[PDB]
Design a protein around this nucleic acid. Sequence first.
DNA 1: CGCTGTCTGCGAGGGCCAGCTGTTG
DNA 2: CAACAGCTGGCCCTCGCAGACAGCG
Lengths: 15, 390, 263, 605
Amino acid sequence: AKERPIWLRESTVQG
Amino acid sequence: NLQEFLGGLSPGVLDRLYGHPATCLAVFRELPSLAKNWVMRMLFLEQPLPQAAVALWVKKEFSKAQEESTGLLSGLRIWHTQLLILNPIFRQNLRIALLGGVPSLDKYAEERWEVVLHFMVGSPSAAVSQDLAQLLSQAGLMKSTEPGEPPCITSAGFQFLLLDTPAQLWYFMLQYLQTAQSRGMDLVEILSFLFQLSFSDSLLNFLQHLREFGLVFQRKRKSRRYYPTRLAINQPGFIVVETNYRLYAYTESELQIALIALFSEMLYRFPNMVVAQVTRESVQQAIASGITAQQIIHFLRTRAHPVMLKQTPVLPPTITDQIRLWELERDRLRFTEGVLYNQFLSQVDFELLLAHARELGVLVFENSAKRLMVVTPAGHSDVKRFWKRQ
Amino acid sequence: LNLLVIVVDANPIWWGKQALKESQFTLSKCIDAVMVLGNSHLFMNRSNKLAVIASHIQESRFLYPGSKDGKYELLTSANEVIVEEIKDLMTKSDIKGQHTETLLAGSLAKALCYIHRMNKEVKDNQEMKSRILVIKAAEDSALQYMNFMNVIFAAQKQNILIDACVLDSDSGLLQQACDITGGLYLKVPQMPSLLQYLLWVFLPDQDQRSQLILPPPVHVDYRAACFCHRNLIEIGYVCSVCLSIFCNFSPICTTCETAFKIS
Amino acid sequence: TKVDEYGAKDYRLQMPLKDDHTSRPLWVAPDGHIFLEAFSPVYKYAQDFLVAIAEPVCRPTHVHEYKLTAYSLYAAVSVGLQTSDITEYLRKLSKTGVPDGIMQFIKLCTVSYGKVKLVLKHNRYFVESCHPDVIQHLLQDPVIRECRLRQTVSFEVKQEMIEELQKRCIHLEYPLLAEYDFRNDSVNPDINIDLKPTAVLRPYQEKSLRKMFGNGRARSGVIVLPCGAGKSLVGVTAACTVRKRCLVLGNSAVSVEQWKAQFKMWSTIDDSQICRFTSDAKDKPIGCSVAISTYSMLGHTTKRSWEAERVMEWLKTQEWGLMILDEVHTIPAKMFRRVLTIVQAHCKLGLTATLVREDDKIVDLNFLIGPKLYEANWMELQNNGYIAKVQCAEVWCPMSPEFYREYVAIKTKKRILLYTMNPNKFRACQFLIKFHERRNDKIIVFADNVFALKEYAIRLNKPYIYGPTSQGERMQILQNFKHNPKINTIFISKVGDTSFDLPEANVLIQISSHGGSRRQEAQRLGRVLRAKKGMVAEEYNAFFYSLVSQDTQEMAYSTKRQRFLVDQGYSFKVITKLAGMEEEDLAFSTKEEQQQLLQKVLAAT
DNA sequence: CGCTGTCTGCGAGGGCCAGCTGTTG
DNA sequence: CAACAGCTGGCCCTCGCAGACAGCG
Ligand SMILES: Nc1ncnc2c1ncn2[C@@H]1O[C@H](COP(=O)(O)OP(=O)(O)O)[C@@H](O)[C@H]1O
Ligand code: BEF
Ligand SMILES: [Mg+2]
Ligand SMILES: [Zn+2]
Ligand SMILES: [Zn+2]
């Protein structure tokens, strides 16, 4: 149902 | 870990350690789930058994557990193939164990341990003891360089501060045990006591050191009887972390404020609250001092106020993310010493030298397009000798 | 953690017959095997608790709720209470010729409720996996089938295992119990070597029993017999009131007194 | 003032600890800073009292902070509080107690209200007070006597020097109570403005007006509410209560039209009464009960055209009972502040959302309009569903090596174009628009640099709005964007950062900005902050993205301009990289394209 | 030949950043 | 001598106004 994109949903930091 | 420590020991010391029954029980307890059964099986048996039989007593499912436990016990040298009977001393000694042959304390342990931490940081009000000072300095987490002047904290000393009290204490004992042999103290005597505690001159000195850390307490002018504390056998949070890089530390202790002040700027001080801001200048200083970002997030994570616990993640992601970026920002340039080779006229031989460098494990980076590579100076002579040989 | 429970069948008539027979196997050794078996369990981990229960033709009594010998101090207390308690029970007892068969369902009933009493006490943080290591040593009693059958279902509902370790006689009813509740069964023929069976087959807990090879289950003959004869019957007739297996067609079943109507 | 070893203001020798501190959620340092806890059971009561006396400094979701300033206190007495009431409740709330310095400070700034009053009547401004002594003290002051026109005692003062009089009155600790008694003012005819029953004001809207109309008289001040909270309705409701001729000062031609529509939607006033005074046209401002205009039109300093001059003559020679000043924070500008004196108004109501400025002139609103009557909490409204939930983000776009080579060397103010026109930044904007359009989201893109706005607009073939675009043309784009499904993304410039009502604009993107303008950032995020139809409180209905160039000066401005939003609890998640970009056919995928772009940027100079 | 709409310069202003003096320890 | 205010210049953009030019009658 129009879920948020991956970058907004979960951290994109390598650490 | 404790089992880790026993594995890194010689067979001679291990058999000596397997003395009074309490030790065998203590080493037995850490057998994960499987080997405990195996120990009971071949306990009344005086005749060695084939290694194949042990392998086939565990179903194909969860087979990896069969091997890992076996490797652990082989490391502990509990049994020997004898071609798998247990150690005659362990079997006998264990059989002795197996039917053969308070509120004040915790406060004392917390306070006495705290004063050691107070001394760790530049706290003027901390317990002073020449033996303790050299112990920490020789423990690899502090350095003086001038006996007259108080010692400072090393790079590893700051990290040790942030570690949780259980791991903070255990690491200290682990370092203490290793240095006990160097200073001339028998490792078996102290190590055996720790196990017996979980339930001579060397011990008297060792017991005094344990009393200093607050793990044990005689309470009777150093009588023969001692009363171990909770920490000797082996808490709600107070920090509120905001999305705007603000820490409100509900602390009365000067130590915790000293800890939080390591990686944040203290703004205001209140009896049950201290306002700290995690400025990049502070965190970069904390990272420069030696701290690792994961510790900072972990240190704030563990001492998290109950109100933040319901939220998930308890630490707002931007704060955790931002701290990491502050850490990663410093190390943008990865300096790496090496020796560069250029003017590779022999293009065909360049690959051969590339293969030779790879085989030796000296090559760090290479560029086939530009026909160049970098090798650490340690292996520079080896490649230089290879080139000279032709 | 695990709450082991050793329901030893300390039947004086049977164990006494062994003394008269002067056989190598004796009750004192059996209690020692139970004792050593009990010590090893607690010895596995601190959190573990156990209990021991005896059986007699009269009544069954719990055998269980410095280091002079050098063993662990806690195990020292357990040995003292069990050693003294069993001797009192065996030495002191009345005589009743009418009742001579060992009782086991009653002893188990004291065991099943003990876990529930102990299950309430244990804190919510720690989940408990209790077990009953029934060690039968005598033939079953005919009149105790219904009573024994209720306890077994109570165990299954509460998920307590019954690892029967019967010896000297294969109890047809007991071997039925261990199957229903998932418990193990074992008919040890080398009574002097009884303990080594325990440390191997029964000692490992349920969470670890699966990841281990153990003797395969024995065939269980779920025999049904008529109430006229007590002979095995494959096709049984029952009524919706008595729920009673009956031999053949009757106008009315006696146990019911119902005005059954033909059709 | 004692400082700890860790540069911390030690306040342990200053105040004690209350025994029942667990229930009490308030701290009060001698510096005045007040740290309230948002998780305490009594938060709701404390916040309303605290926000009135102290303007919030930061309000994260857990622990809020406020600061006590003379202006902050002066608002407390105006609404109805008193020194005894404030200090007693403050002591009751304080879990550590009020230091003697703050206790006397609160008292000092409460014996100044009511001493002097300013009354406008018959096109004449008078300094009214019931105490002759305070008036005499003012007369002793030189500038106060200088601006004088050349029991209760009143002396007339010339209109042109009202500002200087008001500024000195505060400096003399005698604030002028510019309070309008509309209900007892029959001289000005009552207008037929009435609130239609279909219009119901939300609790914060009504609460704000309650402070404005605490007594029978109407109070003049600045009312602050988050962007999209509905300040138009509150402004309209204020006119309905006054029932007098109302002047509304928007920010641009777009502002007045939305003001006009809101009046019609939220009031029964007929279309004939509503009028506009803008360069585009005028709906007969000479005859109108409600006038809508812009600061630029009224504040214009050069000689006015004949069409505008005639209206201006009428405006000056009029008496207004309520002068609504939209986008108040622009008032303290050098010339826009003159519009207050040019027009004669009894009660000046100020509506805004970002009461912040990069200069120190924001405090001038205290006397130019009045005390900050109200300030709603953004998070409180966000959770209530009155404003859409926004997942702010900062997309870190690495700088192109060819560009950075020039950026590091170049320092003659040409950097802004260089890192505004970052090909890496462009691709992120290009990808984001494509992905979000596929999700049926109404995208808005902002860019301070028109050059960047034009470069991106044609390249993506999307409508763009900025200065030169005619009022009708820009109005057309909004209507298309509001309703036309085909127009899913629009490009806007500094013109449309404020007063643009786009309720369905779920997504926002920003590729450029004017320095560290917290006002610009919070205003820009406002466009998409409007409540959505199918909005859900905790579903992150809207989103905000502030594309930035890594290792660039834009990083410093990006942090600077996020200060206001974070103070209100908004967390700006950092996006180092965007997934799915590689598998997308985005522009500037070749060095030749990037090489061509760099040369053009350099050419622009 | 007149009138109205479009487009393009003049002049001014808002908002913010950066700078060479003025001032203070 | 070293260090910090401090109002204005500059730049970007924006706005209102006036003038000329093109479409329409
Ligand atoms: N009480 C209300 N009921 C319904 N819609 C409302 C209400 N208040 C505001 N709105 C809507 O919210 C938006 C407010 O826009 P606007 O008045 O320009 O906000 P602001 O001035 O706060 O930026 C419009 O879509 C308006 O119709
Ligand atoms: F705060 Be709004 F956008 F007028
Ligand atoms: Mg508005
Ligand atoms: Zn029959
Ligand atoms: Zn019947």
